[model samples]
Target: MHKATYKERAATHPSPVAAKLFNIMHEKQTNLCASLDVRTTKELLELVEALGPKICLLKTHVDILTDFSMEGTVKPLKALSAKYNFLLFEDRKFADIGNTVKLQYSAGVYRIAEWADITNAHGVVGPGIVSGLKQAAEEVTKEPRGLLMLAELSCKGSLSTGEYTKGTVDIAKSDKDFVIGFIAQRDMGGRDEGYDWLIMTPGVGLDDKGDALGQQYRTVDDVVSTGSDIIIVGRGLFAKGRDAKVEGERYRKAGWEAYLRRCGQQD
Candidate 1:
């Protein structure tokens, strides 16, 4: 706070890819990031096509793919990202050593490094202890990749006394080489406070009905009120509905409207 000049302070704006994602988000008031957790590629692609400009990003949990085949998933997903100008998250949630993680991300049949724009991680080991993350930042940052931290979960009964708390699980505090993207229930203040890093908020839904037994729920207004930079939504977009596209567009509009309200603008 005392020494560094404005010029000397590290860049806080997201990288080009991340910036593009954020710009689109700000431009469209689009905080909804569609999650592709479907069981098949056809259903996933259909949903993506249906989503169109309503979504700002697309997230995937590749580890859940029982029929996992690189040829089946990567090419099409990449094309969609390029076409839609949205960021693609592999959601590998990589938690392993440097070399092994590197191999898994880049060399395997489902080579995440080949196309995915960003990856999610659980980074709170120790100083010089984040192997996968460090290597990923070194290698992936070459072309530049964004990493999302699994911090501050919204699920009830998650933060037990003996278990991990949000602050303790936060790996961003230990490293500055990477952007500190986190999923939080409460607002982490504004771009000030030196945490201009991206904030991804999940557990979002338009209604209060829960997402099966695993996922939790939050409304569009509640999420926007938290000042979240991004909102991750899964079933909200793909659930049984004939007007999937229309419903998603409404969500994006609502999110932007909330942003305007917080900034003291009339919508």
Candidate 2:
């Protein structure tokens, strides 16, 4: 009965979305969040359909979809999210003011708050970004959503190397209700179990090298064993047109096994 188990986190997490996500991971028996960055609606939907059941989260780049439309993209995305019991996340990384970001989050065509269960932002705008999003979320609609502060960018020579990363954590702690976790390189959990913040680490792949575009890579074991919760993989599951479901499971198994080992579970 380790405190790090999904069962404990699911019951103790403050944010509704965080709790729901932990429950999803615990029930599904996976800790994978496939970073799907396809350039078309067809490609996104096909990959999602195949990998949906294998992941707890679908990290999307909606703006890059060449044929993006509410009916064609968001509608079907919602369907797939429900069908597969995964959450929808847009890597928007908003870095704007309260009013500006609020409108962008709730009123725009994308209306990220309308369907996205979670999204992220940069602390460059300070914690107002979280308050603004929370305002929009409460006034615009009753639907629940969560925010993950960009604490660490998984790129080489990132500005979030040291003190800035610590600053990000401090700002996030200011509003733990809306700010549920971080996109970080290490676990940002609190001093005890109930105060843990879920971590989603990107730049993960089976390989251990950086990409041509500067994106870093870490193995599932390396990430999960180091206290990170979710392994966000992009091309590892899609590169060279590989089968998405099979590759997703490959990463999923590796991630879960690593988590069990980290928490000293072998069953």
Candidate 3:
């Protein structure tokens, strides 16, 4: 299988968000990502302020925020993003018809397009879903935003394989403007796999096993070798008793090193 690096993608990716992400990855020389899954706005801000410099992107579940307000929450996070130079990825895995998802994405208290550099949706809802989001994003943000389709989940008994995975990949491949990639365990095949559609693997960890839920785990080495463009870590980076910055540096090193090894740039 052929693999492409963020260095290459940064130069050529169509969407601004994808190109910006790869540029950041190459410039920083780190593939580390921080999942800000904290329960409150204050905790989210604190963690980002502490660990943002070490990460290329901060992935968030904005719905989980306990004290969510546009002025109080979104604005501060945007400022921190500017300070730390990391993209804000809102994990809104939208799964609905085109019209409905458009409303949810653009016309809510969250108003994802207003702040997020990248957001995600489900391909199972068909390409119309992506078109609606693309319209919404175009209306709200001056620069283009990117979308990741959930092709294959890293969980036991995931139905995101076979023809479903094929269809999802098809959807991503079709929408060159909006859909940038997939949240998958492996590359969805095309001549331009990584260059066109980057693979962002979740459920990554260095030491611990997976949770009670079927959230499977993999080492940085394992994911990078599979041609993953970005490694998404949750509790591994923010677990209790850990210094967020120190842990962020550790994962950043591990993930970048693994990428080097995978690309045969390191021994």
Candidate 4:
């Protein structure tokens, strides 16, 4: 007796934020997210415009942009998000104290709350950081904003384990008003919190298992079968070639088909 679709969890989840994101995913018909971890903002924008239509969300690490400017990066990204009907996810894993993270989240050049549809924080800083983010979101936008906690990392040597991960999940459950879900591994499922938080998994690849880096890779089928709501892919979608849109389509199809098989449905 489990929820087969993300839409089902959206309807039943207590958080309205969770419902908003799931509805968007349902309308978009794809659960794949493109992680733009490039060196320049130009490449990021190109990938967004080309692959935006094929995916539900565009995950970005804005800090790495060599020529980042509000007018340059955020403005165009927001415009593309609207045009392509996708969410903007800023992977700003805010880990500072409540007040410090607030400024870093809302007052910096990035101003994540102003442009990002969703952002993430770390549980290491405790629940006050989540509260600070909720406050920042309230002051910044009237639109629905979502937050995910770093319950676990995809790297092999990551410190997140056992009681530590459970504590992170507990913090997320404590604040459903802003915390929507977690960025964690497949085995992090079945928490029994009964909140229906979305689970987003990175390190998903359609071919290779992993690389020289500590990043552990799982296939779309492996993760989707483990109840991941979204598959966040970086190099798998971008490093293939110059045709990002085509690569995005391949990843999208693979992700969706795996989800279908997991749900016992086929399109």
Over 4 Å off in model 2, which ranges?
A: 1-3, 154-157, 192-194, 210-216, 265-267
Question: Per-model C-alpha lDDT, please?
Answer: 0.63, 0.83, 0.81, 0.79
Which pairs, if any, clash in model 4? none
Local accuracy of candidate 4 as per-residue lDDT tens digits, 1-267? 334586776677666667766776777778888887887889889878888888888888899999999999889999998898888889888888767788888877888888888899888878888888888788878887888999877567988876778888878877676788888766455446556677888878776557412143787888877878898887766564536787778878888888767778443
lDDT of 2 by residue, 181-217 (tens): 9888777767463467888998776767753121546
lDDT of 3 by residue, 49-156 (tens): 988888888899889988899999999999998887889889889898666787788877888888898888887888887788889888887976888888776567
After superposition, which runs of candidate 3 have C-alpha atoms over 4 Å from their true positions? Answer: 192-195, 208-216, 265-267
How high is each candidate's TM-score? 0.81, 0.92, 0.92, 0.91
Q: Name the weakest run of 10 consecutive residues (lDDT summed) in model 1.
A: 1-10
Q: Which stretches of candidate 4 lie over 4 Å from their true place?
A: 187-192, 210-216, 240-242, 265-267
TM-score: the better of candidates 1 and 4: 4
RMSD of each: 5.1, 2.6, 2.5, 2.8
44: Cα error in model 3, Å? 0.6
